[PDB]
Amino acid sequence: MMKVLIVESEFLHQDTWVGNAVERLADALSQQNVTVIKSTSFDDGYAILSANEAIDCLMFSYQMEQPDEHLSVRQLIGKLHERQQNVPVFLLGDREKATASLDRDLLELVDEFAWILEDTADFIAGRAVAAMTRYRQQLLPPLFNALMKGGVGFTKTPSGRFYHDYYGENLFRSDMRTTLGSLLDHTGAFGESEKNAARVFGADRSWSVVVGTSGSNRTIMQACMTDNDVVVLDRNCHKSIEQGLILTGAKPVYMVPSRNRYGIIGPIYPQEMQPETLQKKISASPLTKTKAGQKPSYSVVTCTYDGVCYNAKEAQDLLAKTSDRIHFDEAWYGYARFNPIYCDHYAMRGEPGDGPTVFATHSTHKLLNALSQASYIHVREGRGAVNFSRFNQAYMMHATTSPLYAICASNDVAVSMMDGNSGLSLTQEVIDEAVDFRQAMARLYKEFTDEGDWFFKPWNKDVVTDPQTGKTYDFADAPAKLLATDQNCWVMRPGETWHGFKDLPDNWSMLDPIKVSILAPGMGDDGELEASGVPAALVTAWLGRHGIVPTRTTDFQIMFLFSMGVTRGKWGTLINTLCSFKHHYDANTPLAQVMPELVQDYPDTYANMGIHDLGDKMFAWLRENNPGARLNAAYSTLPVAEITPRDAYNAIVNNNIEMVAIENLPGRIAANSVIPYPPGIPMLLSGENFGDENSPQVGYLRSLQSWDHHFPGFEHETEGTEIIDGVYHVMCVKA
Amino acid sequence: MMKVLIVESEFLHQDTWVGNAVERLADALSQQNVTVIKSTSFDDGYAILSANEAIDCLMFSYQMEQPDEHLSVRQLIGKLHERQQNVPVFLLGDREKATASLDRDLLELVDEFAWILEDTADFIAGRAVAAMTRYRQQLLPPLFNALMKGGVGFTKTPSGRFYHDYYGENLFRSDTLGSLLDHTGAFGESEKNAARVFGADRSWSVVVGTSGSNRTIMQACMTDNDVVVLDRNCHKSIEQGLILTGAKPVYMVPSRNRYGIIGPIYPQEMQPETLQKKISASPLTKTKAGQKPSYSVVTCTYDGVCYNAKEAQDLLAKTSDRIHFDEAWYGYARFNPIYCDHYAMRGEPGDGPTVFATHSTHKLLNALSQASYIHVREGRGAVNFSRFNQAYMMHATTSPLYAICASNDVAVSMMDGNSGLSLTQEVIDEAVDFRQAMARLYKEFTDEGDWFFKPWNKDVVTDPQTGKTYDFADAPAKLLATDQNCWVMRPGETWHGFKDLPDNWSMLDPIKVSILAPGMGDDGELEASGVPAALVTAWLGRHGIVPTRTTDFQIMFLFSMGVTRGKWGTLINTLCSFKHHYDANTPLAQVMPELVQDYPDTYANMGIHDLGDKMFAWLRENNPGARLNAAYSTLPVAEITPRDAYNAIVNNNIEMVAIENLPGRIAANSVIPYPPGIPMLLSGENFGDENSPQVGYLRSLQSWDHHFPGFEHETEGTEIIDGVYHVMCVKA
Amino acid sequence: MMKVLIVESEFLHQDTWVGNAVERLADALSQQNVTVIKSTSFDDGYAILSANEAIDCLMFSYQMEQPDEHLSVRQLIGKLHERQQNVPVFLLGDREKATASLDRDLLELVDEFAWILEDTADFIAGRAVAAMTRYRQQLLPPLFNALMKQGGVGFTKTPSGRFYHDYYGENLFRS
């Protein structure tokens, strides 16, 4: 049903006959089954649109004398088109004045003229209904629009009827080609949607995927390499990127990213991407030795989970020297293109036209807000390009013959949301909120700090600079519009303490504002632990009881993910919970009260204790066992790659497999990848060797286990590891 | 909100004070926010339950004197528990009579006693509400139940809000409970439960369809060093596994019949000695001869041919320790006794060879698209959890959509217990009514010297109880919908048309209703005149009916659990209206306007009959049915592995070769023409000689396309360039 | 059933569009089966809380310019927490001004921020319902809370017993 917002100007209430004429009109619209929303000020109308009140037509009266009004009109209409881009705007005006004002500027604002003191109400109403109808027909994107033109089996059982009524009949009514087209064939509206997605996301062609970025990654890899090829891999890679290695059987070489003192993974340095460096890696590795000097057929780089953004323009030019195919796993980073703060720090920059072949991979569900399993493969065709016929064989490989339309439709509307003005407005809203939160957290931190007290501080720049004025601000004191706009407020520059990446070159990295990492006290700037501190594991647990589960957690880092799904002002809850923690920490309130579920489980360990007592005991273990250094030891230098991930997986199929305990891991080959959290990237991949008797990888695992035993209920998650009889085991190859 | 059906017995209306007491009760329930459905006869109550009125409690009055009533009660309660299995049944009765009758039989029927002329209405109401609450807690299956205890981002744009409101907030709202990939918590409980229901040792819930399921199984069962035994009639996804694994295939060739319908792989083809011969003969496997194959796959056919899976398994067990049945179109089989012994997961699990069963839950169990199950019976050469989950994760997604997994969970619940039998029986019953109705019409027309469509099924059946013999049309419906032998393909029988098919091997699925247009003689040669199915399929298409399968004379209609009762009448009504226009030869301008507008030169001043004759004439002349058999009777020579062939695509050793230059060339991708709709060539196989039957069959398919525009054959693995058939090939 | 007190600041009546936005919010809450109590002055809101009107959430608008208001806010919220100690307090405010004021003192008063001229009414309503739910779950003391999760029936069988039963109420026996 159709919806009209009428805004009566404040400047014409003086003239009561205008309001009467508007009422006659409002009446005429209601008579044609149109919902009318009356509004009595530009301020009120602005606020209604500032909420998300979806209208199909805006009407407004307009005196056209006061300049305060002229502006208020520009603001209102400007506001409408931020997210309601093509809503028809009717001017309810004076014929003489409007006529005289008529110029290009006015016609960009106003779509249609209705002279309200001089025309039949029913005629204007009719014109509006007509304009609202064209708006509606033009609104929806190709695929979802097509789908607007049977769940019966479920209704025959009670449990099935409950399910049916819960999820709704339309979800099933979206099942089946025939006029609409097929996904796998990429025809009809499915084809139109992809052609459209490519336009919006700045690609030559796009491939709609319904098996997630996992499926997308595997698909790209399938098209770009065989077992005869060498490939250059970001060590910080998705599980699915290893999966491709196993299916393809290609020969890998890894680029090792930097870390910092808080345990946060930083970027791969340019030195590591140099042709000469990669060629040395290739000749050194057992897997690639025999294929030295061969041109690698594929290259992959990951935005980091913690929000580190590469200068993709420079990164691409470095990798282009070595490989003709460069794949950026932009799973957490689909929005990048649609806000200028990320300028140059994503794959699909500007308009396509032609360089190397560049792939970009988005998980639409993650941060673009869409149905789970929704993903896109975006392609810029260049050197070593794979055409449709060839690539579609790789696509079909990892697809399903009957995909769920509801997911594909969610991909189509997600495109529409980033297209045009909506994209900028949505991305800006989330940045704005993340900034407000960061700033609020920084101000609290100074308040406590200044008073000789502790608190959590946000991980971001210490000091920023306004370019237009030259003026310098502490983060807390900065203007919000600066931080939410100026990219240089987030670029990681050399000599800066905050980011903590030793010898990071200039104009390479950048912090993503919406990936708000927060730091508990305990880690000194020098890299060694402070006198006392608050371990994050304890905070994460407290947050957990209050229905808040952070994305990442290191020893001192807690990362909160701001997305487009976040409502305005909700970050206040994060602060409120963080403050209530501090209060209980300072008070050392008994665990019986603050964490009852834990004491009930392990009474022997956490008996007659308080929340501060545990914090101190955890922080004590941290000093003694020194895990941060052990982490770096295990990741600084890669384990020796003895066989290919494929060969290692094939050992599983042939049953050359053995569950090896932690203490007998040295000298053994891992059958599956091993990924400890932290840092949450692979320590070992399939086919790599755990190493010496005094190995750092096995070492880091030992400390992780030691933590688990000392602090029950706070056990580390580790993929590739099965805990048997209270002991860490890993599936290994049989010697 | 809660819902009660009260059935006032017909035998107690005589006693008006009973009805008053029931009214007092109905009132008490309404006062506790309970929807009451009053019913005044066992017949009416039976009919309400015979519909699908979901109730949470049944109450009924009961005189307990007349035996006509005693039965009517058994029928009513029996009906309730068909699909509403655990609904609490309240007896609104007389204390003295009920007491005296009380035995085991009564207590199976009645769950709870309420003496209505002797008890406070509010107390009974309370007891009911309590019983309904306990019923509700027990109702839902593990995962979906757990999910009953945020789409906001979409609301910020108008196009997004429209999408959000259309699909509903709960779909997004579904994004302690456990993880799928870890197989923990309620996800784990659901799978353990699914295994129980479907008769497996363990089950794996899949969210990438049977394509993903098939690829997963194959990943766990073979490497490039292995030999594998493949049903030639296989899913595209089974070839995909071959390419990913790099294993060395050998194919089992199924039979066809005169109508072009794919029949079963004969036992002779599954014999160890036959398979060992195939292995030694093939270029891909020659070097691995005498090696024990690590995997074996057999497909229920699309057209409804069901294997005797017990016998088939025992034959394949001799050769391989892993046997995989692709039961994608066939998940229901287990839950109706008419399919007895003709599916993988027979009886209870306990231990033989390791057997896989693959279901597409969305296809015929009725569920969200992409829903699939891998069912496993662990035996010899079994793959344990740790090992298999690595193969599972290989073809999974890190964030799966809960709505799909939940649909898998409730789909299990629907086949579990009584509901499964009742649902499967409903669809069989409907399919039978349709088949019989179609057979009777055919006799009516035939007898009067006229033509019509006949159903593809047995000509004559036999009642075992009586010995008596019936023509299909004349048979009792109860017999056809129950007795398996009415569907078993036996030797010497004309109807099924599979030359030399052994006894007790195959069986026609009742719900896979194939229908036959006239034109094909029993002898295998074409008749004087006929009606080609392509023309009928088109007419059906215009009336919003798109058949699953279509050969030259076969049109197949798929009866499912989603089908409403009696809807087959529409199929007949449309088929009759076609016949009318065919006999009348009404102009194509009227009956098929879209076609004449598109290709006026070809279909000018023509009628529907005229086209039929022209199509049937082409059929006699070009003789495509024989050309089909030529191309499929003998397999093409396998020059390289599908993996090697796919790798040519990656390395760009690729060339789009036109139909005429195909001889001697290797196919880069599989080539699947419809009909028959199974692979003629797979990746890495050679099109063959200068006078090759495969390239031949393609030429005739192309010839048809050119002669009859708008009726073009669909062929996967083929690109039509400049009006010519091309296929992607390897570069010599 | 849940209960919200909304206090429209006296210092923002001058701006009529604020009151409209509050009305849109009040409407959204009512639609989610929440009893709304509107109040048009800090004095009135203070007086309602000064009585013993049991609410599950306090919302208020706030100009944040006059110091007379800053105090009136402190008094109101201070009053709430005298006996309604953990009731969640929503600030219906301006993003820019609130942000700039944000310190430890404010966060002791205000539990949650809702920017009313810039956010969907239904979202705020939802957040309130959520906050009111956690408040309710946290409210009652251990024993009495547990007790909220033959039954006085025997009494109903005699008239004198039914009278007694209805007088003292079913829950007394139910315990």
Side-chain angles (χ1 to χ4, degrees), chain B residues 183-188 190-191 193-203:
Chain B
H183 301 113
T184 61
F187 282 68
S190 170
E191 291 181 343
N193 177 57
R196 179 185 61 76
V197 172
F198 283 80
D201 282 319
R202 52 167 54 261
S203 295

Side-chain angles (χ1 to χ4, degrees), chain B residues 406-442 444-447:
Chain B
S407 92
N408 249 354
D409 196 38
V410 306
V412 168
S413 139
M414 287 173 70
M415 305 310 291
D416 184 33
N418 305 339
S419 46
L421 174 65
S422 179
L423 288 168
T424 52
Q425 194 60 61
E426 194 199 284
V427 58
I428 290 162
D429 281 334
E430 287 300 297
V432 164
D433 286 352
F434 175 58
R435 284 175 180 283
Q436 264 184 331
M438 203 60 32
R440 287 162 188 175
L441 261 38
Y442 182 77
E444 252 197 292
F445 282 112
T446 290
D447 286 0

Side-chain angles (χ1 to χ4, degrees), chain A residues 92-95 97-101 103-137:
Chain A
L92 309 178
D94 176 56
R95 183 171 154 283
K97 286 183 211 151
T99 279
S101 312
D103 54 6
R104 284 184 290 176
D105 284 351
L106 179 64
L107 268 41
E108 269 151 40
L109 273 50
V110 180
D111 292 289
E112 207 133 329
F113 298 104
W115 298 317
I116 199 155
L117 301 176
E118 219 175 341
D119 196 10
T120 308
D122 289 313
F123 295 159
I124 297 168
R127 301 236 306 284
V129 167
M132 294 162 89
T133 301
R134 304 192 200 84
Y135 166 69
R136 280 273 184 74
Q137 276 157 211

